[PDB]
């Protein structure tokens, strides 16, 4: 099947991409820390878990959640809403492409 990438359900990802989408001026392409946290706050979940989910979501700890990162974050909120336990580490199942490898360093000289 196509669209078999990323373990978050296609209908679900569309629903979160939408909100992202409804909150973006069709130009930002990412939400800043406060912006992301504002929507996260509307879950009525504990800040302890919110900070935990944030730390889990933001893969490079930048302070910006893109559409992919937002879908990840809210999906984790959904898990917490569902009353299901959160993992100590995030699985590659829910890690978006390109963000699965980040190395801006190459210094290796032996030959």
UniProtKB/Swiss-Prot annotation:
What subcellular compartments does it reside in? Endomembrane system; Synapse, Synaptosome; Cell projection, Lamellipodium; Cell membrane
This chain's function reads: Adapter protein that provides a link between the endocytic membrane traffic and the actin assembly machinery. Acts as a guanine nucleotide exchange factor (GEF) for CDC42, and thereby stimulates actin nucleation mediated by WASL and the ARP2/3 complex. Plays a role in the assembly and maturation of clathrin-coated vesicles. Recruits FCHSD2 to clathrin-coated pits. Involved in endocytosis of activated EGFR, and probably also other growth factor receptors.
Entry note about domains: SH3-3, SH3-4 and SH3-5, but not SH3-1 and SH3-2 domains, bind to dynamin. SH3-1 and SH3-4 bind to ARHGAP31. The KLERQ domain binds to SNAP-25 and SNAP-23.
User: What does UniProt list as this organism's lineage?
Assistant: Eukaryota, Metazoa, Chordata, Craniata, Vertebrata
State the protein's name: Intersectin-1
Chain positions recorded as Ca(2+) 2 binding sites: 58, 60, 62, 64, 69
Q: What positions does the domain EF-hand occupy?
A: 45-80
What interactions and quaternary structure are annotated?
A: Interacts (via DH domain) with CDC42. Interacts (via SH3 domain 1) with WASL. Interacts with dynamin, SNAP25 and SNAP23. Interacts with clathrin-associated proteins and other components of the endocytic machinery, such as SPIN90, EPS15, EPN1, EPN2, STON2, FCHO1, FCHO2 and DAB2. Interacts (via SH3 domains) with REPS1 and SGIP1. Interacts with ARHGAP31. Interacts with ADAM15. Interacts with PRRT2. Interacts (via SH3 domain 4) with FCHSD2 (via SH3 domain 2). Interacts (via SH3 domain 1) with DENND2B. Interacts (via SH3 domains) with CBL. Isoform 2: Interacts with CBL and DNM1.
Tissue expression per record = Isoform 1 is expressed almost exclusively in the brain. Isoform 2 is detected in brain, spleen, lung, liver, heart, skeletal muscle and kidney. Isoform 5 is primarily expressed in brain, spleen, lung and kidney (at protein level). Isoform 1 and isoform 2 are detected in brain. Isoform 2 is ubiquitous in adult and fetal tissues with high expression in skeletal muscle, heart, spleen, ovary, testis and all fetal tissues tested and low expression in thymus, blood, lung, liver and pancreas. Isoform 1 is expressed almost exclusively in the brain, in all brain regions.
Q: What range(s) does the EH domain occupy?
A: 12-101
């Amino acid at each position: 099947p196509p669209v078999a990438e990323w373990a978050v359900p296609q209908s679900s990802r569309l629903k979160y991409r939408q909100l992202f989408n409804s909150h973006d001026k069709t130009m930002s392409g990412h939400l800043t820390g406060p912006q992301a946290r504002t929507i996260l706050m509307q879950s009525s979940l504990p800040q302890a878990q919110l900070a935990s989910i944030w730390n889990l979501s933001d893969i490079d700890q930048d302070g910006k959640l893109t559409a992919e990162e937002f879908i990840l974050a809210m999906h984790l909120i959904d898990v917490a809403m569902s009353g299901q336990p959160l993992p100590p580490v995030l699985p590659p199942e829910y890690i978006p492409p390109s963000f699965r490898r980040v190395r801006l360093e190459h210094h290796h000289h032996h030959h």
